[PDB]
Ligand binder design. Structure first.
Ligand SMILES: [Zn+2]
Ligand SMILES: [Zn+2]
Lengths: 165, 238, 137, 238, 165, 137
C-alpha cells in the first residue's frame, strides 16, 4: 500500500494542512495524557517540604513552577491544574507555535509539509545587512528582491546562494 | 531588542555572560567558550562533538547516511573568525524571530519553562537535575553551576543535520512526563535548504530556527511526543 | 460567565453607513494567564465575518489596553475598529457599505493573544452570537 | 481518427462491433452490451459488478474505505442516456491520447501486445487462455469467443476508484511472467480529481486514462511489477 | 523514521522525478529478470509443434508473437531474443510511456508525483465541445481559458466543475 | 556499426552564419523495430547542444523519410534543420549566430521514435561525438 509515514511530533511542530491528518481521537488522548502529567507535578509540589541545591527557598522555587505551569493556588497554598488554563497553554504550545504560522508572520516562501527529499543545499551569509535583514529576511524592501520572493530565488539572487554538492 | 549586548567571539570572559563552560553530562571534556545572549539561553559557537560520546569525528560515517543529503567538512566553524560569524548569525535570527508577535510569545514561553526540579530520591524534597545545568567558569578558576533552558550549538559531523537534542535522565522521560529539560539545538546559520516551486527557492533560515525552537518549547514543558510515534496515510490509488 | 453580544444588525443600501457594537463581559483583560505583568502586552478584541457560503474571515481587532489595531490587508481602507476606554465594548464601523460585505459578523476576544496574532492564525477563545448584515439595491 | 464508427449506446447489435457479451471468468452472469471501438479494444458502459464476485453492491462497505476520498451512488451509469454519455466520453479521451505521437505509439503497443498462448498442459502445443477471451453473442443466439487485449469498464461501488484489473490464472502470474493478459480498466470520464497550486485545479481526465493505459501496457507484455513491491524513502529530518 | 512508502510499479508508471528514487541496482535486476522471461517465451515457441483452439496455424500464431516480442528469427526458423531490441522495448514501455511525459505532450497542469491525499473531487462532462476538446482539453484555444490553464482552474471555469462531497 | 560524425565546428563572430553536418551510417531507417510497415511513421535525426555548465538541451530534428520537423519552441526563428534525400546526413543551419548559442552540438538518431518524441522526452539511441561552437566579439 503506497503513501507516507509521518510522525506526530513532527506533524504537530509543522502545523498547516499536515496537522489535519491527526484524527480528533488521537488528539484527545494526547491532551488528557499530558493533563494528568501536570496534575502529577501539582501533586509533587503540594507535597514538597524541603529543598536541596541551595538555590532558594521552597517558596521561590514553588512560585517559579506555579508560573511555568499556570497553576491555580488556593487558600491552603495548594496548587491545582486549571482545565481551561491548561487547554490554552497546550493549545498555545502545539497549535499556535507552528512552523506554518511563523511563515504567515515572516511573509516568506516555504515548503508546505515538513517532508522534503530535495538535494539542493546552499551556503549563505545573513550577517551583512546587504544580504539579509531582521525585517525583510532575504527579500529586501524597496528593492528588486522586494516582491515575488526574488530574494529567496536561487537564480535571481545567486550572489547570496553558493550551491554545494 | 532581544539580545542586548553585542557579542564578539574574541571578547574576554567574565564568568557572567561570556565564559568557558563544561557540561556535567559529558564527563571529561575541554571547556568551551559560550555566550549568554539572553536569560536562560546560551550559544556555543563550536562543532557539537560532545553532546554525544559517538561524535567528535567530523568525518563521514563508515558507509552512507540514510538520507537524501548530507554535507561534511571538518574545517567548518574552526577559526575564531568563523565562530564570530556564527555567533552574529544566530543572534540576528533570534532578533528576527523576536521581531514578531508570535516569536516574542514563543521566546517568552521558552524562557519561562524552566526544567522541573524532580531530581530528588525523596518525595518531599525539591532538587535540581544535573542534566539541566552547566558549569560556568569564573575568571579565578571557580565555577558556578547555572540553570538554563536552551543552548544553540554548531552542527556535528553532518553539517546540515539540524536537531533539538537533550540529555535524558536515567529512568523517567523528561521531555514526555511534564518535567522538561535543557534543550540543545544543533544548528547553523551558514547553510540552508532549497525547494521547488513553479522556480528554485531557498528556505529562510529563521523559519528553520523557528521549527527547532518550537520543538524546544514542547520539550521544555515535557509535553513532547516520542519521535518514534509515527502512523500511516494512504494515497488514493490508481 | 464570559459573554459577547453583537448588535447593529439589519440591512442597508449600497453606500449606507453601518455601526456594529459588541458588549464583552466576564473578561478581566489583565494580561491573561501570564499575569498583571502582561496587562499591556496581551489581549485582543476584534471582528470576523462569514459570507454566506464562504469561510469565516478576519476583519480587524484592537488592543484592550493599548491603541494597537490590525486589519486584514484587504480592509484598512473600508473599515475601522474602535474601543471604549472602559474596555467593555468593541465597535466596527464602515461607511459606503458594499454588497461585498453582506454577511454575518462575529466579535471575538482573547485574554492572552495580540490583536495581530488573533488575525493571522486566526485565533480567539470567545466568540459572539453573530449579527447578520445584508446590503441591497 | 482512432475510433471510426461513432457509436450510440442505443444502436442495435450486430455481433461484430456492437454486441452483448459474457466473460468466461465470471461464471453465471447476465450478458452486457459492449462496443468494439478499435481492434482488440472494447468498451462496456456498465458498473463493474462482475469482474469481482464481491462486487455488485453499489453500496458503501461495512465501516470505512481506508482512503482520503471515496464517492458512492448506485444510480450512476444506470440510464441508457447516461451510458451513451459514458461511451462518448471514453471515445473522446481515446481520440485525445491518440492525437499525440506518444499516445499513438502506446496505443499501437497495446493493440500489438496480445496475451500469450501458454494455456496448454503440454509443452509442444499452443493454446489460448480462457481469461483472455470474451464471448460475443451473435444476432441468432450463437456466440463466438473473441481474443481482446483491453476493456474499459465503468467503476464499481466506489465511483472514483480507477484501476487496471485482470483475471489471474491458476498457477502462473501472467502480468509478471512475460505472457500478459486481457486488461480491464475501471474508469469514468465523468469525474476527476483536483489538486493545489499557487490555486485550485483539476486533473485532465485524459492524463488519468493515460496512467491506466500505461499500466495496461506493462501488463499486456507481462512485465508488470507486483503492486506490493514497495520500498521506503526517508525525509531529511529536523 | 518519517518519509514515504512508494511502489515500484506506480513509481515507474508515473515517471518524472519520482523515478529517480529507484536505484541503478534495482533497475538492472528488474531488467535482466524480464529479459529471462522473454527468453523463456522464445524457448516455448521454438518447441511448439501443434496448436489447439482452432484459431489459425502454428505459423500464424508464431509470427504474431514474434512481432509482439520483437523476436529475431534465424535460418532454422528458431526465435531468439535480441538484447538491443529488448532494451528498447523495455525502455519504451517503462521509461517513455509515463504519465509525466504524457503531460509534456498535452501541455496541461498536473500533479508532480503519483501520490495525492487531496479530497477535492469534481463532476464533469467533456462530451460537449464547448467544455472540452480533443486538442485543447479544458483549456480552449483563442479563449480566456487559453493560457494559465484557466480551463483546469476550478474557480475560473466553475461551470465545468461541479464539486462533490 | 552505427556511427555519427558531427562537423562544422570552430568559432565565429556574433552574426556570422554556421553550418553543421552529421554523417549517419549504420541505420536503415526502415521503420525501426516495428518493421517496414512503419517506414514512414518512425525515426528521427536531430540536434542537441550543451552550454558550458548547462544541461544538454534539444534543438531540432527532422524525419528520415518524411518532411516532419520539430523545434524547441525556443528556436524556430533562429535555426533550421535539413536532411539529404539519401537519408545519410543531417544539417543544422543558423545565421546571425548569437553568443547565447556558444556551446557543444551533438547529433542524435533513433530508429523508431518520431522527431517530436525525440525532442520532448527527450530520447535517442545514438549520439554523435560532439562539435564545439563558440562565438566572439
Ligand atoms: Zn497507478
Ligand atoms: Zn522537526
Amino acid at each position: 500500500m503506497s503513501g507516507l509515514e509521518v510522525s506526530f511530533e513532527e506533524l504537530r511542530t509543522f502545523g498547516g494542512h499536515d496537522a489535519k491528518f491527526i484524527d480528533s481521537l488521537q488528539e484527545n488522548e494526547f491532551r488528557l495524557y499530558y493533563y494528568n502529567k501536570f496534575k502529577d507535578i501539582a501533586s509533587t509540589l503540594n507535597k514538597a517540604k524541603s529543598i536541596v541545591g541551595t538555590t532558594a527557598s521552597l517558596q521561590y522555587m514553588k512560585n517559579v513552577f506555579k508560573e511555568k505551569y499556570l497553576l491555580s493556588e488556593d487558600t491552603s497554598g495548594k496548587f491545582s491544574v486549571d482545565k481551561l488554563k491548561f487547554d490554552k497553554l497546550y493549545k498555545m504550545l502545539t497549535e499556535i507555535y507552528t512552523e506554518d504560522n511563523f511563515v504567515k508572520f515572516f511573509k516568506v516562501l516555504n515548503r508546505k509539509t515538513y517532508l522534503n527529499f530535495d538535494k539542493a543545499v546552499f551556503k549563505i551569509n545573513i550577517v551583512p545587512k546587504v544580504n539579509y535583514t531582521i525585517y525583510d529576511g532575504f527579500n529586501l524592501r524597496n528593492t528588486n528582491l522586494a516582491a515575488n520572493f526574488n530574494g529567496q530565488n536561487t537564480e535571481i539572487n545567486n550572489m547570496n546562494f553558493t550551491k554545494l554538492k | 531588542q532581544f539580545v542586548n549586548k553585542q557579542f564578539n567571539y574574541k571578547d574576554p570572559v567574565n564568568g557572567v555572560d561570556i565564559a568557558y563552560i563544561k557540561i556535567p553530562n559529558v564527563g571529561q571534556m575541554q571547556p568551551v567558550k559560550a555566550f549568554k545572549i539572553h536569560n536562560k539561553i546560551w550559544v556555543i559557537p563550536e562543532r557539537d562533538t560532545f553532546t554525544n560520546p559517538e561524535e567528535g569525528d567530523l568525518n563521514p560515517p563508515p558507509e552512507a547516511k540514510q538520507v537524501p543529503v548530507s554535507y561534511y567538512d571538518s574545517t567548518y566553524l574552526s577559526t575564531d573568525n568563523e565562530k564570530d560569524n556564527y555567533l552574529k548569525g544566530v543572534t540576528k535570527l533570534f532578533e528576527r524571530i523576536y521581531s514578531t508577535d508570535l516569536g516574542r510569545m514563543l521566546l517568552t514561553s521558552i524562557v519561562r519553562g524552566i526544567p522541573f526540579w524532580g531530581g530528588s530520591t525523596i518525595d518531599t524534597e525539591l532538587k535540581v537535575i544535573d542534566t539541566n545545568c552547566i558549569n560556568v567558569i569564573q575568571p579565578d578558576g571557580s565555577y558556578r553551576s547555572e540553570e538554563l533552558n536552551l543552548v544553540i550549538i554548531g552542527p556535528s559531523a553532518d553539517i546540515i543535520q539540524f536537531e533539538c537534542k537533550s540529555f535524558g535522565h536515567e529512568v523517567l522521560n523528561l521531555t514526555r512526563n511534564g518535567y522538561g529539560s535543557t534543550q540543545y539545538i544543533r544548528f547553523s546559520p551558514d547553510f540552508t535548504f532549497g525547494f521547488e516551486e513553479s522556480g528554485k527557492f531557498a528556505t529562510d533560515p529563521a523559519v528553520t530556527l523557528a521549527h527547532e525552537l518550537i520543538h524546544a518549547g514542547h520539550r521544555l514543558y515535557g509535553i513532547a511526543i516520542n519521535p518514534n510515534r509515527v502512523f500511516k496515510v494512504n494515497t488514493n490509488a490508481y | 460567565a464570559v459573554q459577547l453580544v453583537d448588535s447593529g444588525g439589519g440591512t442597508l443600501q449600497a453606500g449606507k453607513s453601518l455601526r456594529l457594537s459588541c458588549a464583552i463581559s466576564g473578561l478581566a483583560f489583565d494580561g491573561g494567564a501570564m499575569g498583571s505583568e502582561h496587562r499591556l502586552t496581551a489581549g485582543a478584541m476584534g471582528w470576523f465575518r462569514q459570507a454566506p457560503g464562504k469561510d469565516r474571515e478576519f476583519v480587524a481587532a484592537i488592543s484592550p489596553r493599548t491603541d494597537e489595531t490590525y486589519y486584514a490587508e484587504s480592509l484598512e481602507g473600508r473599515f475601522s475598529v474602535s474601543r471604549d476606554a472602559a474596555a467593555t465594548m468593541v465597535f466596527l464601523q464602515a461607511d459606503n457599505v458594499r454588497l461585498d460585505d453582506t454577511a454575518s459578523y462575529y466579535c471575538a476576544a482573547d485574554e492572552d493573544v495580540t490583536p495581530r496574532v488573533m488575525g493571522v492564525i486566526p485565533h480567539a477563545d470567545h466568540w459572539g452570537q453573530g449579527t447578520l448584515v445584508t446590503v441591497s439595491s
